[PDB]
């Protein structure tokens, strides 16, 4: 019910463009793999679209041919929208092409995704909101996550985490600035382990966007833990696949906005020890920090963190965040079953970005996010399916 269509481009995703000395038996591979994605794409209702600008000519074994003629003899069930051949579609990179799909085939822009490779795609489908697939099985990618390796890798996405009703095991709101969404619930019996990188980013992904949660948002961020010496563990190991996915939400993923810097029951604990910091790191690949405080008045950030139990780290994320004047989204990926959130709000005024120091006294618990009234009406098995699955017949 929420993916409606996939649009792929061409340039290294269906034909190989940037080295023609691609492994042979590679392509024939690939042409095998996509027919069995395309395969599985119409199985669901879901249509195939191909984007291109130019009707180019094809080399193939019998001789040239265009792609139009390729495209359709190779993969007859699709829809070819080609820029060459219909004045009425906008230039792609503007992301205009978007709204010209929305509108032929009468769909919403989270019903589509794009897959795609060259930069001209990644803006098409950003520049067009839309979610990006960077397909990455002809030309690799080593500066970010979030990637697809071989068309299967897209089936199982889509499969997975893209089929069923329920996006969010778990999700409440207070007032009109507390947002809670939880992407499963979590028990267990003690006081990465569960699942692995990509399958993390992939489930977040596809909740985030298919819900619509990431319209309009210009950050995601990690909290930290409470070690102020080893604070960055999610985050480190999260970094490469979270700076995937805000690229393909065309938002800006912030390392190290939050600090531990002490080490750290009362949600004191949690405000008593962590800031914002006035000068994370703008340019992941440099390392280059803002020169000022990023500008959060008035932006939506995605606060991103494993466990939410009683809400103690989303809800100081949140007190320091909107204190800056940000619009707060907590999301987490497992929610504690039975389990209450308390929302709190700061009676003393927060300098977020330095330390603080409140008392007991100083926090107003206005309100409760209960659990039994917010889940939306398992993991273990998610895993196992995403870890094990295949084309099915
Ligand atoms: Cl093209």
Known sequence: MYLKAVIFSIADVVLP??????????????????????????????????????????????????????????????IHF??????????????????????????????????????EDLQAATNGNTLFINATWYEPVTEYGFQFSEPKEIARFIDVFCLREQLWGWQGHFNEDVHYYALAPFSTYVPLSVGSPDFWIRYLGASIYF??????????????????????????????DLKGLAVSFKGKYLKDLFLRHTTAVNITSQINTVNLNPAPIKNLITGERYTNPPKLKGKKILVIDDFCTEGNAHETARMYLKAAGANVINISWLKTINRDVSICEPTRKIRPWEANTLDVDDINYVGTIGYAENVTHVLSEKIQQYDNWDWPQ
């Open 17 to 78: 463009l940037t080295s023609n000395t691609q492994p042979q038996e590679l392509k024939s591979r690939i042409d095998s793999e996509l027919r069995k994605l395309f395969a599985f794409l119409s199985s669901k209702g879901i249509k195939v679209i191909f984007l291109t600008n130019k009707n180019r000519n094809v080399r193939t074994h019998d001789g040239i041919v265009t792609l139009d003629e390729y495209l359709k003899r190779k993969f007859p069930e699709s």
């Open 82 to 119: 080609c820029r060459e051949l219909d004045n009425n579609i906008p230039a792609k990179q503007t992301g205009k092409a978007i709204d010209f799909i929305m509108a032929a085939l009468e769909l919403k822009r989270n019903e589509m995704i794009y897959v795609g490779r060259s930069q």
């Open 211 to 240: 819900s619509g949660l990431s319209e309009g948002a210009s950050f995601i961020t990690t909290y930290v833990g409470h070690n102020a010496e080893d604070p960055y563990k999610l985050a480190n190991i999260m970094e490469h």
